[PDB]
Design a protein around this ligand. Sequence first.
Ligand SMILES: *C(=O)c1cc(/C=C(\NC(C)=O)C(=O)N[C@H]2CCCCN(Cc3ccc(-c4ccccc4)cc3)C2=O)ccc1CC(=O)O
Length: 106
Amino acid sequence: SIQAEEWYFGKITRRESERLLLNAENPRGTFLVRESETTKGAYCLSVSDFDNAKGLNVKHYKIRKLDSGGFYITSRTQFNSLQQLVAYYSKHADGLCHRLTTVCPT
Ligand SMILES: *C(=O)c1cc(/C=C(\NC(C)=O)C(=O)N[C@H]2CCCCN(Cc3ccc(-c4ccccc4)cc3)C2=O)ccc1CC(=O)O
């Protein structure tokens, strides 16, 4: 159950996710998964980043869940569960701003 996942922040807003991620103590890849504010049944993976151009910043990726069962950010790379998707992106940056590292502090 994703509700049981410590990285699943459920119903928190985009602004709140940014308030939490925009902490100078957060290394690149600090993340959380929350419900999308506007797309029923989709989620957002909010991730912190840092570079010398933008400084500390946050990116949000839409995670889709099909009624067919799969979870994905890009349809070409799907997962059997949100947990597997999180595990995969913690090892591969692929198209993300950074690989997922640690769960965002509350
Ligand atoms: C949550 O569902 C959510 C997410 C978004 C996402 C974006 N909109 C805004 C205003 O932030 C968005 O544009 N995100 C960027 C992120 C940075 C990368 C550029 N792209 C296109 C893209 C996305 C992902 C990948 C990729 C990822 C992993 C592997 C392979 C490829 C490539 C290219 C973005 O989408 C907007 C709204 C919401 C709903 C909410 O905030 O509540």
